[PDB]
Amino acid sequence: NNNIIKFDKARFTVLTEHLIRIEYSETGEFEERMTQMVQNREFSEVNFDIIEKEETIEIITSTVHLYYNGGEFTNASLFADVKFNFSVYSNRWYFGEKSDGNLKGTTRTLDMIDGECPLEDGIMSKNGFAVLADKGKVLTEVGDIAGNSVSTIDLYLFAYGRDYRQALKDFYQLTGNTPKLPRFALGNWWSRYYDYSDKSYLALMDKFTDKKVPLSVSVIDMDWHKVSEVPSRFGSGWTGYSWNKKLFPNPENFIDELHQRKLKVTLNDHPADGIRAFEDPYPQVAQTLDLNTELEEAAKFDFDNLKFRKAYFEEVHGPLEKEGVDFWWIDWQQGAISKSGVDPLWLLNHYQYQNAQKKHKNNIILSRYAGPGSHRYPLGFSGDSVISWASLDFQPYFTSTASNIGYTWWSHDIGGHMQGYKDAELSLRWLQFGVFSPINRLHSSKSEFTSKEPWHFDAVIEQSMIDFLQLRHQLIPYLYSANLITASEGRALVEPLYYEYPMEEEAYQHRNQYLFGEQLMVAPITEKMNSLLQMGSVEVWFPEGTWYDFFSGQPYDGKVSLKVYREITEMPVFAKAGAIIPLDKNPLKKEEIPSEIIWKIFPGADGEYLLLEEDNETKAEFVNGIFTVTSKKESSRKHTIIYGEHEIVSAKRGEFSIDLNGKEENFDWNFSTALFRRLDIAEISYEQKDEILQQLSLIEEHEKQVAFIKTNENQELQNSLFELLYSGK
Template structure:
């Protein structure tokens, strides 16, 4: 048995426990850093240890919040200050970078990343955690008991929970390195992870509108025409996305300039989009073709990686790929600061053209036919294997930090396919990859997004309708939007996407613009338009929630146990979630009008067009009323958003449903702001917001406003108005406006609306006002 050394304690400052090479350091009274062997050179942690007062009694070290006890074998036990056991270490192999923990028998654990298996609880899970197109990992796990772990290791890691315990087993490492966080709740753990790795900057206000995309618009004329048609139809739109190959051939892959003949004046295209009151996002990658300037400069400096990546063939217009003409495309070493600087030097061309946002594709990155030599390739800070999972963090951070230095008054908005811990601090929103178009995959997106949010990263979205819809093209290429099976799936996916921070339609195999599904007055078209219009009405609520995400460590998408942990019925709920603190989103994730079509593909088989064609459903009566059963968490009263009907929590309720209506509820005590319908964010002022008040409990809401698209809010240029509802007195108090910013509304009207239809208009000039209802 190894000889144990006594605990060495500092009365004020950090506390360290050494048993051979075990080190325990209090970062805060409720966060402990544990290192056995050599610590990881961090790419994630930005917090510095606080001056924490600790007390030592024998082998026990305590702060005001947390106690760490070491047994004779060197294993640690984490306890509350009152002595309640939170988590125990069981076995450790320092040389193998492996640590096992013991959990309670029925203890639920959550997080890790976007695992696409439809589950919330990670008990019984076995998963090799390596970034990929469809699954991404942040190494952050939390328990229903209110503790969390961040496993500080960037190599692929096997996570396994079984009868022997819960284990993290890294492929590379000179020791075990992790952070134990006692947040007391899901929100508390998220707040501590952000304390360690960075807060969440505000996205521009316009990013919360509707985004249209597809794989891909093939000319500048086509891209502009999409915006034109949305405007002509009076359907709201705020963003258009230009996907790949605007640069020309695959040998010019990711040249970061408009080199294709059909994009001969890309700068003018962007200006034209802006004149139409829309914003422009463009696809960029973590790899470069051999004829690009970036490739040549990076290659000269040894900053390219040797492995095979997308695209594999240099011939871009032929499918399947002609492999005898390899593309030569290589991924850059995003870990190297010089490589990141070169990346931004060329990306600045598009920035100067006026691009508003970046679509960073393949930030996993794509890594085909991996060889051992690829994994052992030297990168900045280690080997490809040792740094592998942190690649998305480094490439996104490189852009964020460079653009902040070259600020043109635009907040940074990056949509990326992959993410690692800490990435929330660098202006990024992750989407769930090239998912297929199926009900099974739609169902999986809900827990995948919630699991991602539980790692501290709040910004998540999916390709609405699924990326690969080719199996629905039963009447020729691109016919899926006319297929009732796909129409129903698409509408229900829209109704889920309504409650994601980014609301974006995208996919391959068929276009997804609203007019592809019919015309105004037809049920599917009208259902899609209804969701878009509702999204715009919700933007004041959503933007105010964004401020709480930034200032108060909140989340947009909240698993039900975040707010109702005492209700065990919600611990494993995968088809409902809270959208902010007020709205219970209960999207329909099973077909009601057509038969479910089982489609199973992964990203590669999807790209290889191996979908199986199905039958086209005929004769669907979209006007028929259906039913759905949803569970309402106990501990509060709930209101149907659409009807105002009250329900007591703690029960299943059966609802009448229609194709154009998503089930959603509002908890008692909520104050919900609804904005005007508009064609784009900023078209209309928020000078007459509808404030819905839901009685049955006391409640409050902070309405947040700022300039919408710069970082002046960081200097205090914003305003808040606090609304408080006193349920016993039936009084709504609108508080004094706090703060100001250029262009702020000085006077306005609030229309107060109760579930029973009662309304009252209130003129407001910034001073405290009370309204009796």
């Protein structure tokens, strides 16, 4: 109320020093109701100043001057100067105009996208301000669409400068926090647009077990329902709510079998053709909606209609949930048209997410992005990406940049959805990224040739995919703790580099590089390997400090930008001196919570990690070479400790503390072994290999080893040898 100012037909609410709501009302009434985007305008009071005259008003905070000259909002009447110097003359917002500096957000979908597509703006800007227009409908108390806002213009001016994390936290306070995911969502999902039988699906699930690949989720795509069995007078088989009985003669029994294998089960739902007269639930729906059954009147999709939504959840989904379906894959691609003006995809995500909470605690959906605030309905489903290096090269940037509009749970089809071209190396690189993405869901097109099964590929590719898929389940504790941090504290699992390093120009120059939780920095390789090196590469920016390759221990002295090379089976993931990462020791075990945690410690500095769980909190501290583990509640959990290289403690129960000062701090990784391996795999001349090995062995001074490699005629081989010299310096 002191944070509220009316002037002419406008209303201004100073929510934080850095966040102002700006409204216009012809009627003099302004909007207090929630909207599709905004769930909460309750914020603690803040200091600001006002200069009010007859004709004009200026609102002044620590970061912004907002001016209003009266009348209708125009670029001339409503504008703001930030109190920052990030630019020479892009420090002014004008109503209705775009400025430079927006770091972007996300978009609905990657359907049919081969590589890059345009993104919407987010709330983050290098120049320190962004405007988020609220164009949505108002809600009722219980979250039904109520109609048009009486605030016919309703904007949020963000003026956080480059405090991106606080901008995002306050956005979550305005639009509501992301809910907690359930632990099962963070495991591997299996999916394929393939007409499995109950028998061939269970045989595939048992082959995953036999192949030592853990799964959390069993997706059944659209061939679960009638497709070619649909008479053409009704249109296509794309939408379906009736089991194909040939393939699934006893659905509940099939779902019981997946449940006995400790899998959660989801079905594809294409809702757009509604419930037509051939469907199994049609007689019930027709009775509830008073349809003309002798004229075979369809229950057309209509999520604006309360009776339709009830029949959809109770009489269409209800019978399938009773057969054991755990959650819904909402797969909408049929446009944004409704008589209400609300995007049907928005109505589906909002209502289905709420309905999912009835059957299961912290339940999810799987659906496309439905605009600002739709993070309240995880998980994101990016859809029909084209299978290409260009698509993979876009995806890490896409994923990290989405955190800028608070949409932090994108599930991409890992390996790409459709079209494009076969390349087992592309499939393996894509799975490496997926394992270090918010969700790891293997999925593919209707092709006989696009299965993401590891054993589709040669023995090298298969073993590497199996190792990465196991690593995903090892990461579930770290992922689930970051998930609770997203839900409780408004911090993204995947952050662009500029969230941690806002003032470092290099944090804006590595689009595909990101922080993954608080302990790991990932630089996926998204380019086909150089056949002369038998290695792929990516330019990595190393922030100030000592960094270790998470897998090898190879060290890097920051701050530096350095091209790094990896075999197709290895991924650039880095941890700082002092990093502590927990890993499940038993990733193949079907355990609700890990019976055994490996604490992986990176030497050379202090650190700590807080492991949040369903029913506990465990703190791991590393302070002057003393490692301590405590928990809120006690348990039988057995702790394993790995300090750099060496397993120090194995399966020790309860709370404890152990001194690692005089333990071996150094990893195995050495310049000589790594040099030999890189030269050995290279498809270069044996004379060159022999000369490089002899000269780098005989030349003692680091500066002369570098001078030697600088004479090499292969420019990319120079860069690979320079990486090793830089790490071995």
